[PDB]
Amino acid sequence: SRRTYTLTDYLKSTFRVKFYTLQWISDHEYLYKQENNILLFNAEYGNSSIFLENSTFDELGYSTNDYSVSPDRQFILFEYNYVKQWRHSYTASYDIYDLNKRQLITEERIPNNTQWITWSPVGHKLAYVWNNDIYVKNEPNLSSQRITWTGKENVIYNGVTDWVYEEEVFSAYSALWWSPNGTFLAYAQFNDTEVPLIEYSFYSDESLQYPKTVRIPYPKAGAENPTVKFFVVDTRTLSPNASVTSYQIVPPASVLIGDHYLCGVTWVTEERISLQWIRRAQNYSIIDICDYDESTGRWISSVARQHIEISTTGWVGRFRPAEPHFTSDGNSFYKIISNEEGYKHICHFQTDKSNCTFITKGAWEVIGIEALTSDYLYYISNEHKGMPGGRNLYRIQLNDYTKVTCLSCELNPERCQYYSASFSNKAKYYQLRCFGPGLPLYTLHSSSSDKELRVLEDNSALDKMLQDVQMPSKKLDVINLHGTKFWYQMILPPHFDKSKKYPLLIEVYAGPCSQKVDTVFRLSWATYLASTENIIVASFDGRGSGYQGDKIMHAINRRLGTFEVEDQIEATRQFSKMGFVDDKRIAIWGWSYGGYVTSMVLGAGSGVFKCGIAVAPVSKWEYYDSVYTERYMGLPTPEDNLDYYRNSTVMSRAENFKQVEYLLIHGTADDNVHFQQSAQLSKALVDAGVDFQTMWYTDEDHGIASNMAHQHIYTHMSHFLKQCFSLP
Amino acid sequence: SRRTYTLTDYLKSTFRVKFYTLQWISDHEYLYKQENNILLFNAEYGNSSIFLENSTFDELGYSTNDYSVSPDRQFILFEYNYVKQWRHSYTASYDIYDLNKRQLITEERIPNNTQWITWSPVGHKLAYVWNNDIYVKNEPNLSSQRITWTGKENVIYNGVTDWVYEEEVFSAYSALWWSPNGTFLAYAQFNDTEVPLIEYSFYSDESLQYPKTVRIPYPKAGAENPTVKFFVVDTRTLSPNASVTSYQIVPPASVLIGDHYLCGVTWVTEERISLQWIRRAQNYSIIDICDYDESTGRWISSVARQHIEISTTGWVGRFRPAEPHFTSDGNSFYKIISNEEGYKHICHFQTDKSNCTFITKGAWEVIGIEALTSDYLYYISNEHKGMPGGRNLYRIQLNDYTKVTCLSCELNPERCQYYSASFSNKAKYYQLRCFGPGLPLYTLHSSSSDKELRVLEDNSALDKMLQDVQMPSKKLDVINLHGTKFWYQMILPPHFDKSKKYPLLIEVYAGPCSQKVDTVFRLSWATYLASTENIIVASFDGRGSGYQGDKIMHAINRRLGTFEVEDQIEATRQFSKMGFVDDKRIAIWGWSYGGYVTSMVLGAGSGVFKCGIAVAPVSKWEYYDSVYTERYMGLPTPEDNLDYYRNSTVMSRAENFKQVEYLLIHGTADDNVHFQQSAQLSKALVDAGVDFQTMWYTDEDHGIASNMAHQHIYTHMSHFLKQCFSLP
Ligand SMILES: *[C@@H]1O[C@H](CO)[C@@H](O[C@@H]2O[C@H](CO)[C@@H](O)[C@H](O)[C@H]2NC(C)=O)[C@H](O)[C@H]1NC(C)=O
Ligand SMILES: *[C@@H]1O[C@H](CO)[C@@H](O[C@@H]2O[C@H](CO)[C@@H](O)[C@H](O)[C@H]2NC(C)=O)[C@H](O)[C@H]1NC(C)=O
Ligand SMILES: *[C@@H]1O[C@H](CO)[C@@H](O[C@@H]2O[C@H](CO)[C@@H](O)[C@H](O)[C@H]2NC(C)=O)[C@H](O)[C@H]1NC(C)=O
Ligand SMILES: *[C@H]1O[C@H](CO)[C@@H](O[C@H]2O[C@H](CO)[C@@H](O)[C@H](O)[C@H]2NC(C)=O)[C@H](O)[C@H]1NC(C)=O
Ligand SMILES: NC(=O)[C@@H]1Cc2ccccc2CN1C(=O)C[C@H](N)Cc1ccccc1F
Ligand SMILES: NC(=O)[C@@H]1Cc2ccccc2CN1C(=O)C[C@H](N)Cc1ccccc1F
Ligand SMILES: *[C@@H]1O[C@H](CO)[C@@H](O)[C@H](O)[C@H]1NC(C)=O
Ligand SMILES: *[C@@H]1O[C@H](CO)[C@@H](O)[C@H](O)[C@H]1NC(C)=O
Ligand SMILES: *[C@@H]1O[C@H](CO)[C@@H](O)[C@H](O)[C@H]1NC(C)=O
Ligand SMILES: *[C@@H]1O[C@H](CO)[C@@H](O)[C@H](O)[C@H]1NC(C)=O
Ligand SMILES: *[C@@H]1O[C@H](CO)[C@@H](O)[C@H](O)[C@H]1NC(C)=O
Ligand SMILES: *[C@@H]1O[C@H](CO)[C@@H](O)[C@H](O)[C@H]1NC(C)=O
Ligand SMILES: *[C@@H]1O[C@H](CO)[C@@H](O)[C@H](O)[C@H]1NC(C)=O
Ligand SMILES: *[C@@H]1O[C@H](CO)[C@@H](O)[C@H](O)[C@H]1NC(C)=O
Missing domain, CATH: 2.140.10.30 (Dipeptidylpeptidase IV, N-terminal domain)
Known part of the structure; x- marks a missing residue:
C-alpha cells in the first residue's frame, strides 16, 4: 500500500x-x-x-x-x-x-x-x-x-x-x-x-x-x-x-x-x-x-x-x-x-x-x-x-x-x-x-x-x-515572462498524472535579493501537502529576485509590492493553463515578506486565487525598520518616495479581499514585523466590511518557532487549506 | 411568501x-x-x-x-x-x-x-x-x-x-x-x-x-x-x-x-x-x-x-x-x-x-x-x-x-x-x-x-x-433542576414545525446577580438566527442568577464557574430531549461572563455541545479586577480561596476543547476583561495541542461597539455557526 x-x-x-x-x-x-x-x-x-x-x-x-x-x-x-x-x-x-x-x-x-x-x-x-x-x-x-x-x-x-x-x-x-x-x-x-x-x-x-x-x-x-x-x-x-x-x-x-x-x-x-x-x-x-x-x-x-x-x-x-x-x-x-x-x-x-x-x-x-x-x-x-x-x-x-x-x-x-x-x-x-x-x-x-x-x-x-x-518529486523548470527567462519549481504529488486535475498552492517569498527556487533538498510542509494531500506546491522567482543580475534584482527598486507581486500572478496564470492544474482550487501562502506578497496578491483582484494564508506579514512599509525598508524604498517623505509608500500597503487593496478567503496569522511578541502590522491590516478589512480569518499567537516572535506553536500553526494552516480546497 | x-x-x-x-x-x-x-x-x-x-x-x-x-x-x-x-x-x-x-x-x-x-x-x-x-x-x-x-x-x-x-x-x-x-x-x-x-x-x-x-x-x-x-x-x-x-x-x-x-x-x-x-x-x-x-x-x-x-x-x-x-x-x-x-x-x-x-x-x-x-x-x-x-x-x-x-x-x-x-x-x-x-x-x-x-x-x-x-416568537417557561424550578426562554423560528429537527444555540450570560430570561422585547442577533437561518435560540437562568432570592443567588459564592456552568449543561440536556431539537447540532455563545461560561461549558467534556463562541471572556479570575472578583471569590491566597481560583480557569479545561469547535474573540483594547485573558487562554490551548478559531478586533474595547466592528463580529459569528450547523 x-x-x-x-x-x-x-x-x-x-x-x-x-x-x-x-x-x-x-x-x-x-x-x-x-x-x-x-x-x-x-x-x-x-x-x-x-x-x-x-x-x-x-x-x-x-x-x-x-x-x-x-x-x-x-x-x-x-x-x-x-x-x-x-x-x-x-x-x-x-x-x-x-x-x-x-x-x-x-x-x-x-x-x-x-x-x-x-x-x-x-x-x-x-x-x-x-x-x-x-x-x-x-x-x-x-x-x-x-x-x-x-x-x-x-x-x-x-x-x-x-x-x-x-x-x-x-x-x-x-x-x-x-x-x-x-x-x-x-x-x-x-x-x-x-x-x-x-x-x-x-x-x-x-x-x-x-x-x-x-x-x-x-x-x-x-x-x-x-x-x-x-x-x-x-x-x-x-x-x-x-x-x-x-x-x-x-x-x-x-x-x-x-x-x-x-x-x-x-x-x-x-x-x-x-x-x-x-x-x-x-x-x-x-x-x-x-x-x-x-x-x-x-x-x-x-x-x-x-x-x-x-x-x-x-x-x-x-x-x-x-x-x-x-x-x-x-x-x-x-x-x-x-x-x-x-x-x-x-x-x-x-x-x-x-x-x-x-x-x-x-x-x-x-x-x-x-x-x-x-x-x-x-x-x-x-x-x-x-x-x-x-x-x-x-x-x-x-x-x-x-x-x-x-x-x-x-x-x-x-x-x-x-x-x-x-x-x-x-x-x-x-x-x-x-x-x-x-x-x-x-x-x-x-x-x-x-x-x-x-x-x-x-x-x-x-x-x-x-x-x-x-515521496513527492521536485521538478525545476523555466517560463517566459515579458521577454525574460525566469525559474520555477514544483512539488509534485507521487504517481503524478497529467490527466488528473490537482489543486495548486503557490509558496511565495519574493523578497528583494531572495531566492525561492533552488536545488535544496527539504523535508517541508509542502512535502506533506503533495505526499498525503495531493496538492501541487509551486514556487516562483520573478522580478526583484537575486542571483540573476542587477537587471532582475533592481527591478523593484523604489517600488516594493509591484513587479514581484505582479509576476507571482502572471506565473500562476501560466501554471493554471497547464492541463493538470485545477483553476478552481488555487492558493497562495507566505511567511514575513512572503506574507506581504501573499496579501498583495490576494488584494490584486486577479480572480486567479481562491484563498491564501499570510504569516507574520508586512502590511505597511512605514511600519518596518529603516535599514531594510529605505534600502529598497528610500525615505517616506513627499520630497522622496512617499507616493510609492502609500500605494504599496495591503490596506490600500482591502476592498479586493471580499472575493478571497483570507487567513492572517501573527505572533503577538513579534519584534521584527510588529503585531501592529497585522493589527492595522485587520482593522482596514473590518472597516471595508471584508470577512476573513485570523490567528494570533501569544508570545511567539517572527519565527513562531516554539514547539507547540510550530505544531499548531501548520495544523491550523492545513485545515484552512483543506477547507478551501474542499479536501477530506 | x-x-x-x-x-x-x-x-x-x-x-x-x-x-x-x-x-x-x-x-x-x-x-x-x-x-x-x-x-x-x-x-x-x-x-x-x-x-x-x-x-x-x-x-x-x-x-x-x-x-x-x-x-x-x-x-x-x-x-x-x-x-x-x-x-x-x-x-x-x-x-x-x-x-x-x-x-x-x-x-x-x-x-x-x-x-x-x-x-x-x-x-x-x-x-x-x-x-x-x-x-x-x-x-x-x-x-x-x-x-x-x-x-x-x-x-x-x-x-x-x-x-x-x-x-x-x-x-x-x-x-x-x-x-x-x-x-x-x-x-x-x-x-x-x-x-x-x-x-x-x-x-x-x-x-x-x-x-x-x-x-x-x-x-x-x-x-x-x-x-x-x-x-x-x-x-x-x-x-x-x-x-x-x-x-x-x-x-x-x-x-x-x-x-x-x-x-x-x-x-x-x-x-x-x-x-x-x-x-x-x-x-x-x-x-x-x-x-x-x-x-x-x-x-x-x-x-x-x-x-x-x-x-x-x-x-x-x-x-x-x-x-x-x-x-x-x-x-x-x-x-x-x-x-x-x-x-x-x-x-x-x-x-x-x-x-x-x-x-x-x-x-x-x-x-x-x-x-x-x-x-x-x-x-x-x-x-x-x-x-x-x-x-x-x-x-x-x-x-x-x-x-x-x-x-x-x-x-x-x-x-x-x-x-x-x-x-x-x-x-x-x-x-x-x-x-x-x-x-x-x-x-x-x-x-x-x-x-x-x-x-x-x-x-x-x-x-x-x-x-x-x-417575526419569530418568544416562549417563556419553567424547568426543574435538582428539585428547583428555574426560568428559561426560547426564540422559535417562524412557522414552527414539530417534525423537523432544528439546531439549537444557547445564549448565555449566567453572571452572579444577573438575568438572561425576561419579557423584554429585543430585536437582536437571535431574532435573525430564528427568522432567516431557522435556528432555535434558548437562554436559561440557573444557580447564581438574581431576582429569585439569596439562596439561588449565593449558590455560586466562592465557586464561580461551577454551578452556573453545570446548570447550563443540564438545562440544555433537558432542551435536547424535545423532539424538535437536533442533539447533534447544539451550540453555546456568550459575552464577558457569558464568554467565560461558554468556554467553561465547552471544556466540560459533556459531549452536549458541538461548537461555541466566546466573546471577550474572562479565562482566569486572578486576571479580573478586585472589587467584582473578590465579592464572589474572596482572595486568591492559600489561606483563603486560591484552591477554587485555580480549578476554575478555562486553561485547566484545555484538554476537553479537542471535542468541540471553538471560536475565541477578543478586542485588543479591552480595558475591562483584558486581552491578556484570551491571550493566556489561546496559549494554553496551543500548549495542549487543541485546534480552535480566533478573532482579535484591533482597538476595540469590551463592547466591540464601533460601527464596522459590530457589523463584522456578528457576520463572522454567523458564518462560523452556519458552518457548524451545516447550513447553506
Ligand atoms: C503605485 O502607483 C503606481 C503609479 O500609478 C503604479 O505603477 C503602475 O503600475 C501599472 C501596473 O498595473 C503599470 O501599468 C504602470 O505602468 C505603472 N505606472 C507607473 C507610473 O510606473 C504601481 O503599480 C502602484 N503600486 C501598487 C503596489 O499598486
Ligand atoms: C560517551 O561516549 C561513548 C563512546 O565511548 C558513547 O557510546 C557509543 O554510543 C553509540 C550509540 O549512541 C554506540 O553505537 C557506540 O557503540 C558507542 N561507542 C563505543 C565505542 O562505546 C556514548 O553514547 C557517550 N555517552 C553519551 C553521554 O552520549
Ligand atoms: C496617595 O497615597 C499615598 C500612599 O500610598 C500617599 O503617599 C504618601 O505621602 C506621604 C505624605 O506626603 C509620604 O510621607 C509617604 O512617603 C507616602 N507613602 C507611601 C508609602 O508612598 C499620597 O500622599 C496620597 N496622595 C494624596 C493626595 O492623598
Ligand atoms: C474544582 O474544584 C473541586 C475539586 O474537588 C470541584 O468539586 C465540586 O464539584 C464536583 C463536580 O464533579 C462535585 O461532585 C463535588 O461535590 C464538588 N466538591 C465539593 C465536595 O464541594 C469543583 O467542581 C471544580 N470546579 C470547577 C470549576 O470545575
Ligand atoms: N535572511 C536573509 O535572506 C537576509 C540575509 C542577510 C544578509 C546580511 C545582513 C542581514 C541579512 C538578513 N536578511 C534579511 O533579509 C533580513 C530581513 N529583515 C528579513 C525580512 C525581510 C522582509 C520582511 C521581514 C523580514 F524579517
Ligand atoms: N451591569 C451589571 O449587571 C452590573 C450592575 C452594577 C451595579 C452596581 C455597580 C456596578 C454594576 C455593573 N455591573 C456589573 O456586572 C459590572 C461587571 N464588571 C461586568 C462584568 C462581569 C463579569 C465579567 C466581565 C464584566 F465586564
Ligand atoms: C594520526 O596518526 C599519525 C601517525 O603518523 C600521528 O602523527 C597523528 O598524531 C595522528 N592523529 C591524531 C589522532 O592525533
Ligand atoms: C548618545 O547620543 C546622544 C545624542 O543622541 C548624546 O547626548 C550622548 O552623549 C551619546 N552617548 C554616548 C556615550 O556617545
Ligand atoms: C543615491 O540615493 C540618493 C537618495 O535616494 C539619490 O538622490 C541618488 O540619485 C542615488 N545615487 C545614485 C548613484 O543613484
Ligand atoms: C592597582 O591599584 C590597587 C588599588 O590602589 C592596588 O591594590 C594594586 O596593588 C594596584 N595594582 C598594581 C599592579 O600596581
Ligand atoms: C397650558 O394651556 C392651558 C389651556 O387650558 C392654560 O390654561 C395654561 O395656562 C397653559 N400652561 C402653560 C403656561 O404652559
Ligand atoms: C466576610 O468574609 C471575611 C473574609 O473571608 C471573613 O473573615 C468574615 O468573617 C466574613 N463576615 C461574615 C459575617 O460572614
Ligand atoms: C483678591 O486678590 C486679587 C489679587 O491678589 C485682587 O486683585 C483682588 O482685589 C482681591 N479680591 C478682593 C475681593 O479683595
Ligand atoms: C424645527 O422645528 C420645526 C417646527 O417648529 C419643524 O418644522 C422643523 O422640521 C424642525 N427642523 C429640524 C428638522 O431641525
Whole structure:
C-alpha cells in the first residue's frame, strides 16, 4: 500500500536529515561532536583522538548547548543557560575548563547573563560583553578588565549590536574584532538615545497576573537611527591601574556628511584594518583601509586606500556590500562587485589604487569568496548549467585567470547541484556540503590532489526510511515572462498524472535579493501537502529576485509590492493553463515578506486565487525598520518616495479581499514585523466590511518557532487549506 | 411568501424601535427632544411650550449630543465634543446659554476636555471636574474657583472615579454630590498610587507609525486597591482670595480598620448626609448618617445613626448594597434588604434606631424604590404572576401596609410585563416605560387617580413594518433542576414545525446577580438566527442568577464557574430531549461572563455541545479586577480561596476543547476583561495541542461597539455557526 509523508512526519521530524558540523582549528585538524564527545580529527589520514570525553559534560551539572576551544587548545569554554533574545542575540552563562589539569575554573568566572564572548585568534585571551560593556580577560583564572563604561540598557551598546544592526546589517549580535595576533580589540559602539521605542505586551507564564511591556529601540522607516562609533583598543596596555588605550576611527568625509552605517570590519594585518561604511541611502559604500602608526598609536586613513562602490539602478550588494578578502600581505584584495553587464563578479583591487580587474565574468553571479592562498582563490557561484538555483565551488589560479576548475560540479551531478564549503586554516583541506537535490552529502577533500578523502555523512539511514514512504518529486523548470527567462519549481504529488486535475498552492517569498527556487533538498510542509494531500506546491522567482543580475534584482527598486507581486500572478496564470492544474482550487501562502506578497496578491483582484494564508506579514512599509525598508524604498517623505509608500500597503487593496478567503496569522511578541502590522491590516478589512480569518499567537516572535506553536500553526494552516480546497 | 428578518436588518437597525426620553424639572412639567426642538410639556393638561427651537442648535456651529437645564430655568448646558473613555466615563466641551438674554456665555468658559459637570439642585451653580480637579462656578459668567490641588493623571481623582469605582462600585464616572439647597458640595477623592497598571497597545489610526501603550491603574484580584477620602465642601466661603472650607468624613471604626470602599452617598437634608461604606470582602456594610455642626463646621457620626448590614452566606446586595431612601424630615428611611427567607424587600428603618420593620414580604424581590411621599412608597418588583423576569410598578400606603396597588399590571397584560418608571419632582406624575413582551409603549400617568393621561410613544410605525416580516416568537417557561424550578426562554423560528429537527444555540450570560430570561422585547442577533437561518435560540437562568432570592443567588459564592456552568449543561440536556431539537447540532455563545461560561461549558467534556463562541471572556479570575472578583471569590491566597481560583480557569479545561469547535474573540483594547485573558487562554490551548478559531478586533474595547466592528463580529459569528450547523 505504501505510507505517505504525513503532517505528523514533518511536525515531529520523524525523518531525520543528518549533518556534519566540524570546526577547523588548524591547517589539517578539526573538532567534531560525536555523541557528546569532542573528537580531534586529522584530515591528512583520518585518524581521530579524544579531545574531551562525554563523561566530562555529565559532571558539570548543567546541560551544555555549545562549546568553544581556545586556538592554543589549552582551554575550552562551556556555554549553558541559553536565553534567546532576537534572531542571533542571546544571553548565557559560561564556564572555562582547563585541559592541562583537567579541572573547572571557579575563580573570576564569566558573569551570568553574558551577551557575547569570544576567544582571541591566538592563545587563550577572552573578550566578553556584559551589561552592554566589554571586558577582557588575559588569563581564565585572572580577574577581567573593564574596557567600556558607557553601557546602558536600551541606550548604549558596546561590543554588541542594537536591534536594527543585528537584523539588517551584521546578521549577528557580535560587534567585536580581535586582531589576528590578539594585539588589538576593535569594537563598534551603538547609540540609540534618539531611536523611538516599539512597545508590545508580553504575557509570559499564566501565573503572571499583569502583562509586561517589552520596549525595544527600533527605527521604523524614516525614523531617527542609531549612531555608531568604532574604536580600536590596544590590549597590550590593559592593566588594573591603567587607562584604556583606544583610537576612534571615523568614516571618510563622503560618508560622514550624513546618516551612515558601519557594515563590515576586516582585519588585514596586525597593523592594518579595513572598514566598510555605507550611507543611509545605501547606494553609496566606501572601504577605508587604515594603518597603525607605531609612533602615535593612531590608525591613519588616506584617499589612496579608500575604495568607493556605488549603485545607480538601486542598492549596493545583496543585503550588504560584499566583504573584501585581503591577501596575506594586505597590499591587494578580492571583492564581489557589480560589473558593466550588471552581474556580480570578483574584482581584484589593489589597496592603494582605485581601479580593479575583474577575474570572473558571465551571465551568472559569484555568491561568495570562500578561501584565498597566494596561488588560488576559492569561490561559490551559480555558473554550472546556467541554473541560478544551484551552487558550486570553483578554484581560479591567481597568476592565470583563465585556469578555473570546478571542484564540485561533477562529483555527483544528479544528486548534488547545491554546494557550500568550509576550508582549513591555509586552505589545505575543505569540507564540501551538498544540500540537494538529493540527500545531503558531506565529504572531505584535499586541495593539493582535488581528491575526495572520505565520506563524512551520506545520510544512508535517511535513505532507508524514505524508500518506505510515498515521496513527492521536485521538478525545476523555466517560463517566459515579458521577454525574460525566469525559474520555477514544483512539488509534485507521487504517481503524478497529467490527466488528473490537482489543486495548486503557490509558496511565495519574493523578497528583494531572495531566492525561492533552488536545488535544496527539504523535508517541508509542502512535502506533506503533495505526499498525503495531493496538492501541487509551486514556487516562483520573478522580478526583484537575486542571483540573476542587477537587471532582475533592481527591478523593484523604489517600488516594493509591484513587479514581484505582479509576476507571482502572471506565473500562476501560466501554471493554471497547464492541463493538470485545477483553476478552481488555487492558493497562495507566505511567511514575513512572503506574507506581504501573499496579501498583495490576494488584494490584486486577479480572480486567479481562491484563498491564501499570510504569516507574520508586512502590511505597511512605514511600519518596518529603516535599514531594510529605505534600502529598497528610500525615505517616506513627499520630497522622496512617499507616493510609492502609500500605494504599496495591503490596506490600500482591502476592498479586493471580499472575493478571497483570507487567513492572517501573527505572533503577538513579534519584534521584527510588529503585531501592529497585522493589527492595522485587520482593522482596514473590518472597516471595508471584508470577512476573513485570523490567528494570533501569544508570545511567539517572527519565527513562531516554539514547539507547540510550530505544531499548531501548520495544523491550523492545513485545515484552512483543506477547507478551501474542499479536501477530506 | 413574506421576507425574513435578515442579519442586515439587525446590523443596520432597519426596523427602528422608538422611545420617549423626558427630563422632569418640576412636579408637573418635563422637557422632550423632538425634531431637535426642546419643548416644555405640561403633564397637568397636555399643552407644550417651545423652550428651545431647533435652529438654536444650528447657529452654534457644532453638533450637540446632550443638554442640561439649570433647575431655576435661567441657563442651559450644551454638551459637545463627546470623547469616550470607559463604560460610563467621557470628556466633553461645554457651553452655557443664557435663556433670559438668549445669549451664549463667552467669558470664563467651561474648559476643554471636561470630565464631569453638574448643576446644583437649586439655582444655577456649576461644579465640574477638569484634569482630575474640582471647580465651582457660582455664576455662569463668573470666574471658576478651584476646589482641589491634588488632581494627577492616573494617580489622584477628585470628583470622578478611577477605573474600578466606575465599573464596579458607583456604576458611574461622577463622584460629586451637591446638597439639596446647594450649600455643600460633597466629593470623593480616589488615590491610586499603589495600584498596579494594566498596559496594552493601542494602534490608533493607520498613520500612527509607533503604537502607544495605554496605562490604567487597574487592581486585579487581591492586588493593592485605591484608597478613598470623602469631603464636604462648604461652598458659601468660596472666594478668589479664600482657602477652601472642607471637612473629611471617615468611615466608622468597624470599616476603618481595614481595606474598604465608599459605595453610596445620599443627601438627606441640608445638614444631614448619609454615607454607605463596605468592607473589601463585601459581606459587611454600614450606613453612616452624619449631622452638620453649625458651630464648628464638622460633620458628626453617632453609633445610634449607624446601620449595619451583613451577609454570612455571600455578599451584601446585588452588585452593591441598595441605597437608603429618606423621608423629607430625615428621621426615617426605607431600604431594600434581605429578609428571613432571603428575599429582597423594603425595610422601614428609623434613623436613630437599629431594628427595622419589613413593609413587603413574599417569594419575590423588590427591584428598587422609585419614589417616596409622606403618604405613599412607589417601587418596582417581580411579584406579578410569579415571574422573576417581569417588572411592575407598585404603590404601598405608609399608614397601611395592606393597601398595595399595582399601577402597571393590568394596563396591557399581554403587551407589557416589563416596566420602568420616572416620577415627577413631588411624585405627582409619572411616565411608565414598557419594554415587553410586546413592542415598547411609553405612557404618562397622574398619581392622583392613576389614569393613563396620554400615549407618548407606542411604536405604531414599527408594528406596521413588522407585519411584512416573518417575526419569530418568544416562549417563556419553567424547568426543574435538582428539585428547583428555574426560568428559561426560547426564540422559535417562524412557522414552527414539530417534525423537523432544528439546531439549537444557547445564549448565555449566567453572571452572579444577573438575568438572561425576561419579557423584554429585543430585536437582536437571535431574532435573525430564528427568522432567516431557522435556528432555535434558548437562554436559561440557573444557580447564581438574581431576582429569585439569596439562596439561588449565593449558590455560586466562592465557586464561580461551577454551578452556573453545570446548570447550563443540564438545562440544555433537558432542551435536547424535545423532539424538535437536533442533539447533534447544539451550540453555546456568550459575552464577558457569558464568554467565560461558554468556554467553561465547552471544556466540560459533556459531549452536549458541538461548537461555541466566546466573546471577550474572562479565562482566569486572578486576571479580573478586585472589587467584582473578590465579592464572589474572596482572595486568591492559600489561606483563603486560591484552591477554587485555580480549578476554575478555562486553561485547566484545555484538554476537553479537542471535542468541540471553538471560536475565541477578543478586542485588543479591552480595558475591562483584558486581552491578556484570551491571550493566556489561546496559549494554553496551543500548549495542549487543541485546534480552535480566533478573532482579535484591533482597538476595540469590551463592547466591540464601533460601527464596522459590530457589523463584522456578528457576520463572522454567523458564518462560523452556519458552518457548524451545516447550513447553506
Ligand atoms: C560517551 O561516549 C561513548 C563512546 O565511548 C558513547 O557510546 C557509543 O554510543 C553509540 C550509540 O549512541 C554506540 O553505537 C557506540 O557503540 C558507542 N561507542 C563505543 C565505542 O562505546 C556514548 O553514547 C557517550 N555517552 C553519551 C553521554 O552520549
Ligand atoms: C503605485 O502607483 C503606481 C503609479 O500609478 C503604479 O505603477 C503602475 O503600475 C501599472 C501596473 O498595473 C503599470 O501599468 C504602470 O505602468 C505603472 N505606472 C507607473 C507610473 O510606473 C504601481 O503599480 C502602484 N503600486 C501598487 C503596489 O499598486
Ligand atoms: C496617595 O497615597 C499615598 C500612599 O500610598 C500617599 O503617599 C504618601 O505621602 C506621604 C505624605 O506626603 C509620604 O510621607 C509617604 O512617603 C507616602 N507613602 C507611601 C508609602 O508612598 C499620597 O500622599 C496620597 N496622595 C494624596 C493626595 O492623598
Ligand atoms: C474544582 O474544584 C473541586 C475539586 O474537588 C470541584 O468539586 C465540586 O464539584 C464536583 C463536580 O464533579 C462535585 O461532585 C463535588 O461535590 C464538588 N466538591 C465539593 C465536595 O464541594 C469543583 O467542581 C471544580 N470546579 C470547577 C470549576 O470545575
Ligand atoms: N535572511 C536573509 O535572506 C537576509 C540575509 C542577510 C544578509 C546580511 C545582513 C542581514 C541579512 C538578513 N536578511 C534579511 O533579509 C533580513 C530581513 N529583515 C528579513 C525580512 C525581510 C522582509 C520582511 C521581514 C523580514 F524579517
Ligand atoms: N451591569 C451589571 O449587571 C452590573 C450592575 C452594577 C451595579 C452596581 C455597580 C456596578 C454594576 C455593573 N455591573 C456589573 O456586572 C459590572 C461587571 N464588571 C461586568 C462584568 C462581569 C463579569 C465579567 C466581565 C464584566 F465586564
Ligand atoms: C594520526 O596518526 C599519525 C601517525 O603518523 C600521528 O602523527 C597523528 O598524531 C595522528 N592523529 C591524531 C589522532 O592525533
Ligand atoms: C548618545 O547620543 C546622544 C545624542 O543622541 C548624546 O547626548 C550622548 O552623549 C551619546 N552617548 C554616548 C556615550 O556617545
Ligand atoms: C592597582 O591599584 C590597587 C588599588 O590602589 C592596588 O591594590 C594594586 O596593588 C594596584 N595594582 C598594581 C599592579 O600596581
Ligand atoms: C543615491 O540615493 C540618493 C537618495 O535616494 C539619490 O538622490 C541618488 O540619485 C542615488 N545615487 C545614485 C548613484 O543613484
Ligand atoms: C397650558 O394651556 C392651558 C389651556 O387650558 C392654560 O390654561 C395654561 O395656562 C397653559 N400652561 C402653560 C403656561 O404652559
Ligand atoms: C424645527 O422645528 C420645526 C417646527 O417648529 C419643524 O418644522 C422643523 O422640521 C424642525 N427642523 C429640524 C428638522 O431641525
Ligand atoms: C483678591 O486678590 C486679587 C489679587 O491678589 C485682587 O486683585 C483682588 O482685589 C482681591 N479680591 C478682593 C475681593 O479683595
Ligand atoms: C466576610 O468574609 C471575611 C473574609 O473571608 C471573613 O473573615 C468574615 O468573617 C466574613 N463576615 C461574615 C459575617 O460572614
